[PDB]
Structure 1
Amino acid sequence: GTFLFTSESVGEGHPDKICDQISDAVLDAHLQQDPDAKVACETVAKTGMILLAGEITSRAAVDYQKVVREAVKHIGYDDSSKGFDYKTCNVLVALEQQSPDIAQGVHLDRNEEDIGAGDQGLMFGYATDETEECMPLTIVLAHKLNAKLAELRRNGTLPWLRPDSKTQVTVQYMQDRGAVLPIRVHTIVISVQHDEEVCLDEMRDALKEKVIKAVVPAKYLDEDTIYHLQPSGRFVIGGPQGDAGLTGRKIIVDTYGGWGAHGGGAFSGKDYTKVDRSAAYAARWVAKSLVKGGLCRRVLVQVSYAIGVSHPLSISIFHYGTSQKSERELLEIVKKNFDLRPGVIVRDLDLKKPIYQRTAAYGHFGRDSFPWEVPKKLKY
């Protein structure tokens, strides 16, 4: 019954993640002034460049140069020696208004509760009782390893660290009537950008002793655990200089690390009318409510929409065999307890609030008691 499963995460300075954080900094800047801003902000990052491309219709007056540079400063790219500098990079803007054809079909002259979905699409939510936060252990550990690197970089413990990092955790699991039980950590990968002076042995020793041991419980690590620490051997060039980044290129790191499923839509840079984000948050909320409500040990929820139509076209449930109730019965409970129209989700989950930049690194789920993380008490 044992099997392996692997998930990854990336740090705040990974170039794709930089783009997600900038897109969400732009969204938050608009929402701070105009709660009804229509935002679809894509970011591209390459050596010396941040480009904003997309569509925004808003009453806000946003200084894009300032917002982008402040987000890059927070990440830690503040000197040409690190490969990128917020003070001196190029910020290019190619932002236009939202298409009037989309606006008229989605939200113009519509009652807010009856606003149409901002696009068609499918979205999934997932939850698992294997951790208290209802997330897979593989991705929780991978995110915590990146957070630990950023913490040790920022506190000056490991001053050779730079912001760009990736981690990957393989866990050996057992299964119990469809539920999954972590046994041990089989393999860990960590790659992190570093300065020119530190040697490979110093980095590998620090990654094991100060990063892994500070994050992963000793009970999961044993003589057989495999460690791939700085496996490329050299990672001085990093950030956008090493690899072009784009918004919405870490959608599995943003969600469930290979567990569950994904409908394809990116989250960052989008206001609530874009169901790629709002309905995925609501689907997580449903899945977590079913698990915390004791109806399932783990569950996957699909929802789908048509552009301009408020009610979902379909809702579906997959409980992996972890409920005494059928998936048909769980779907009936979901339909009695939730209303997944985007104009209702916005109210339930407070989606006009400018908290989006906080979601754009370390996963959107299983952290900080955001509204989609607070289970709904179910009536049935």
Structure 2
Amino acid sequence: GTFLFTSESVGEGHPDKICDQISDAVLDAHLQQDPDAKVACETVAKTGMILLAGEITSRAAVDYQKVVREAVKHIGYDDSSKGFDYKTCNVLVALEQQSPDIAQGVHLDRNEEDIGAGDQGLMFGYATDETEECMPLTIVLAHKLNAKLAELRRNGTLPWLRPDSKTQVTVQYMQDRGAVLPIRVHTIVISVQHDEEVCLDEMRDALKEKVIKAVVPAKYLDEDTIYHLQPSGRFVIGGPQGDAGLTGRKIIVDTYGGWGAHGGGAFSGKDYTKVDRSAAYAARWVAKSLVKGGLCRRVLVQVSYAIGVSHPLSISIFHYGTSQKSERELLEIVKKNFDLRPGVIVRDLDLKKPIYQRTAAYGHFGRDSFPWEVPKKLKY
């Protein structure tokens, strides 16, 4: 009854994550001035370049040079020796207004509660009782390993660290009536950009002793655990110089680490009318509410939309056999307790608030008691 499952995470200076953070820094800058900004900001990163491309209609006056550079500064790319520098990189802007054809079909002359979805699409929410925060252990540990690297970089403990990192955790689980129970950590991968002077043995020792042991409970680590620490052997070139980044290329890191499902849409750079984000957040909220409400131990929620139509086209509940109630009964409870129109979600989840840059690293879920993480008390 045992099986393996693997999830990954990346650090704040991973080039795709740089892009997500910049896209959300732009979104937040707009929302600070215009809560109703329509934002669809993609970011592209390569050696020496941040490009913004997309569509924004907003009353805000935003200094893109400043917003981009401050985001890169925060991440830690502040010198040519690190491969990227906020002070001296190129910032290029290819931003136009939102298509009038989209605007007229989605939101113009519509009551806010009755605004249409900003696009078609499908979205999933997921929750699992295997951790208190209702997230898969695999991805929680992977995120925490990247956070630990950033912490030890920023506090000067391991000053050879640079911002670009990736981690991956394989856990052995036991099946438990549709729920899953972590047993042990089978394999850990860590790759992190480093300075030219530190040797592989120093890095591997530090990664085990100061990173892994500081994050992963000893009860999960044993003589059989496999460690792949700096497995490429050399990672001096990194950030956008090593690998191009784009917004919305870490959508599984952003969500459930391979568990559950994904509808394909990216989160970062998008205001609440883009259901790719708002409906995914609401679907997480539903899933977590079902688990915290004691209705099931593990659950997947699907919703879908048509552009210009407010109400979801479909809603589906999959409980993995972890409830006494049927999936049909759970769906009825969901429909009686939630209104998944985007113009209602915005109110319930406070989605005009400029907190989005905070969501753009270390996963959008399972952290910091954002509104979608505070379960709804269900009536049934």
* TM-score of the superposed pair, with normalisation by structure 2: 1.00
* Alignment-derived partner of residue 308 in structure 2: 308
Matched residues, percent identical? Answer: 100
How many Å apart are 1:229 and its aligned residue? Answer: 0.1
Measure how far apart 1:141 and its partner are: 0.1
5+ unaligned residues in a row in structure 1: which ranges?
A: none
User: What CA distance in whole angstroms lies between the structure 1 residues aligned with 2:61 and 2:304?
Assistant: 34
Cα deviation, 1:32-83, whole Å, max 9, x if unaligned, reads 0000000000000000000000000000000000000000000000000000
- 1:79-120 deviations in whole A, cap 9, x for unaligned? 000000000000000000000000000000000000000000
Cα deviation per residue 1:248-303 (whole Å; 9 max; x = unaligned)?
00000000000000000000000000000000000000000000000000000000
Please list the CA deviations of residues 107-145 of structure 1 after superposition, one character each: whole Å capped at 9, or x if unmatched.
Answer: 000000000000000000000000000000000000000
Q: Which runs of 5+ in 2 are unaligned?
A: none
CA offset at residue 206 of structure 1? 0.0
1:191 counterpart SS class = strand
Distance in 1, matches of 2:25 and 2:307, equals 26
Give the Cα separation in 2 of the matches to 1:232 and 1:324: 48
Which secondary structure state, in structure 1, belongs to the residue aligned with residue 126 of structure 2? Answer: strand
**Distance (whole Å) between structure 2 residues aligned to residue 321 and residue 80 of structure 1:** 54
Distance (Å, rounded) in 2 between the aligned partners of 1:68 and 1:296: 43
State the Cα deviation string for residues 340-364 of structure 1 (Å, max 9, x = none).
0000000000000000000000000
CA separation in 2, counterparts of 1:18 and 1:117? 28
Residues 1:128 and 2:116 are matched in the alignment? no
TM-score (norm 1): 1.00
* 1:20 partner SS: helix
1:226-248 Cα shifts (integer Å, max 9, x gaps): 00000000000000000000000
Aligned length: 380
Residues of 1 paired with 2:227 and 2:183: CA distance? 17
Provide the secondary structure at the position in 2 that maps to 1:135: coil
Measured after TM superposition, the shift of residue 168 of structure 1 is: 0.1
Query: 1:341 matched to which residue of 2?
Result: 341
1:338 CA displacement: 0.1
**Residues in 2 aligned to 1:288 and 1:149: alpha-carbon distance in whole angstroms:** 29
Q: Distance in 1 between matches of 2:250 and 2:325?
A: 34
How far apart, CA to CA, are the structure 2 residues paired with 1:322 and 1:289?
A: 14
Note the C-alpha offset of 1:323: 0.4
Name the SS of the counterpart of 2:208 in structure 1: helix
SS in 2 for 1:105: helix
Residue of structure 2 in register with 1:239 after alignment = 239
In structure 1, what is the Cα distance between the partners aligned to 2:323 and 2:250?
31
